[PDB]
Amino acid sequence: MKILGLIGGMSWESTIPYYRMINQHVKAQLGGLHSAKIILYSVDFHEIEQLQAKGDWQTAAQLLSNAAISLKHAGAEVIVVCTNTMHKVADDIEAACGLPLLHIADATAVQIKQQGIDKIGLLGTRYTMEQGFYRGRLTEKHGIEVITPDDTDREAVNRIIYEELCLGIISETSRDAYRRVIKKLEAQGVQGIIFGCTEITLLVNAQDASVPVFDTTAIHASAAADYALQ
Amino acid sequence: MKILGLIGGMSWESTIPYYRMINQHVKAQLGGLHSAKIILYSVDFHEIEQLQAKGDWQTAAQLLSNAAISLKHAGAEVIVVCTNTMHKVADDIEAACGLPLLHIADATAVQIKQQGIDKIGLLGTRYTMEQGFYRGRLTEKHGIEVITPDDTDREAVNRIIYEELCLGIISETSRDAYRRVIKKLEAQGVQGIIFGCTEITLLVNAQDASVPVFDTTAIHASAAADYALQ
């Protein structure tokens, strides 16, 4: 099996689901007492936060790129970034370390395609919803049309993540706001909705939509196990 | 802070509490969005169990040692083995990688000695209660007298962990048995009791003892965080 290099700690709470699910998938596929071979570089989140606060994505890219190279030295054969948003620097990481990088958007696209879907709604941080790294990749690489909320609604979705969910605040009114945004996406004729942030799943679930939901973190973890065993 | 190198996957389920507790300690001490700097090498448990089943400690030590060396290449400055029985080859791993290794028995011995305790009761799997790597180390290295239950009670304790607690089964007769064994250790004049694995606390806790109880796993994770921050 391939040794997976995970870059996490952003936050450590959202890294645990990867570690759990990759291991569960490997055990299911191989049986015995098998678990995944994982080398996880868990950074101090504060360092990344200070960089984001200064808009210094260059240095943030360097920090995670260096983690990837360290994982390569340790024997990792592929890189898995355990956060949707930090894929903002995935191209930098991949170019820097020379290992394959299992991109979260590509893993989601696989499942979307498997369901025959060509038009999807997308929820996440503003970065994830607006920028080329995730939304642009679904479309330009995989030919999937992506619909996001309007600006006022993206502001609310984003604020709730950083302001509440990230701090462990799970609000009923925030849930109702997401429920409304979901209905608006569905009104645009989307065939499914991507929950493109681990924390979103703390607030809403499959019962809050009338179309298939895609939990990108869970899908990414499953994809990572599949890759290790391929 | 120092970068911690964790060797886990033995099993992965028991690695999660280490990762969680170490991060929680760092957040509590440093505040803000601080998390621990951790590089975790999670091995395939099937390989380790197979070697252990053959009594091939030499190869097992080599495998863990290679993991420790990998972590060193990635930047780890200290090694924490997130399991109890593999500590049988802790001194070999430490010598092989040239990094300090925070031994699970040593971390607990420090707490016991600081509290003035010189006679301790030990509960855990049969291996932990009988073998040299944990109990022998407390005595030979730290000068602490170790009392264990009698043969009948060790068998009962061990059976309950393997056949019940490990299966998620909580029996009220088994809880009573553990309570009785604790009282028996206390009647022998122990000044504290070590819980050698986390499974024990599914049945009993400090409320069941008149002497202090030492959760060796919890102490290990706390010692790791402390070392990283010193």
Next chain:
Amino acid sequence: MKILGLIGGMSWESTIPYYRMINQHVKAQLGGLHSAKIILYSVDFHEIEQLQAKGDWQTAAQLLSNAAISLKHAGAEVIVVCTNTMHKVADDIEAACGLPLLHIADATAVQIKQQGIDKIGLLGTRYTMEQGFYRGRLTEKHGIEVITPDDTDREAVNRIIYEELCLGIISETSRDAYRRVIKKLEAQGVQGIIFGCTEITLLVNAQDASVPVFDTTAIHASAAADYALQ
């Protein structure tokens, strides 16, 4: 005594306590060398889980119905399904085999009513807390008022069972969460609290509650023994 037909293997770990407790109850009541007369059909959980994940309740019903008919052929006189959520198709299983089925929700309702309680708290998976087969059955069939946690707390309770407890992962923050949810239920005026699955006991127990706890699994086993002896 009646021959009990147990349908288990969902999972096999969960079946062991039913088998043990029923036998213990019979021995306690009849004394001497008596044990229960049990015929157990233990299914392949993989088949059930796959059907459950696809929402194919019809086929799941057929599978368990065939198990029940098999037990009838072997001489069983009553059916006990050793799991909570498959009770979703209990009425279909009962009809298929023509034997009485001792429903997990009825057994607990009976204990609640005998203790003069008409307002109860309910903790369990989201299935159990939200669907008709258990929650709705307590209220509709037995006239018992059922209070469950709010949306947020239900998500947490459920996530913790699936993501942690089922894996043996005991998290103190999770323990704290359950303790708060219990106090919130009590604040609501519930006269007792049901633990819908044994996983909950891994984290919390009677000490954590100011009201009587109803372990629906233990109660189910007790009811099965009592019925056999009736």
Next chain:
Amino acid sequence: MKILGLIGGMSWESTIPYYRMINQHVKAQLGGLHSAKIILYSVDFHEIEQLQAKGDWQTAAQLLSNAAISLKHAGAEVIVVCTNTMHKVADDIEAACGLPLLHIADATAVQIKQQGIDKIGLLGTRYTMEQGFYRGRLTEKHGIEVITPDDTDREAVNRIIYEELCLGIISETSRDAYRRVIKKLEAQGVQGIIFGCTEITLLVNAQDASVPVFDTTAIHASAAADYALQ
């Protein structure tokens, strides 16, 4: 997967280890969430005992045979009798139901022969050590010579199983007796030793023998799981 028909041991405590081990083996070999398909018939020992006391051994035998015929009706494809001593009626059961019976002695014999062994020492209840059903099968059917302890040692071995080991009592003097009996078998030139029941492993194990030891009950459960998967 074949459906296994298990006939419970006189004590349900003796049956649970078969259910646990078979399931663990199937999960290990197949992965997923797979568990064994087992139909277990667990009798009320009182009923058997009462018939025997009355001197009606034929009806008592018919009762176990009846259990096997019932398992056939339920769809079992092979009979597995739990415990070595129970095999005293294995021949009767097999003749009565017409299903293949996976005999504890045959499962162990093929493992012994694979190791190139043709002379073994046998420890167990006096029944197991003296009667035809187990040892006779090893010698007559498989060509394995069987050495047993002398009469005084058989009495001791037997008493210790019934009076101590079945109750989980571990006596140092009993352990010493078993160790001596092992050396006496080794002195007779045995190439391996069979532990007739798993209770024996409470006193002695591989560390006490200078020849390979065979836990025939554990081997039996392993063989049952293996056969279900063929």
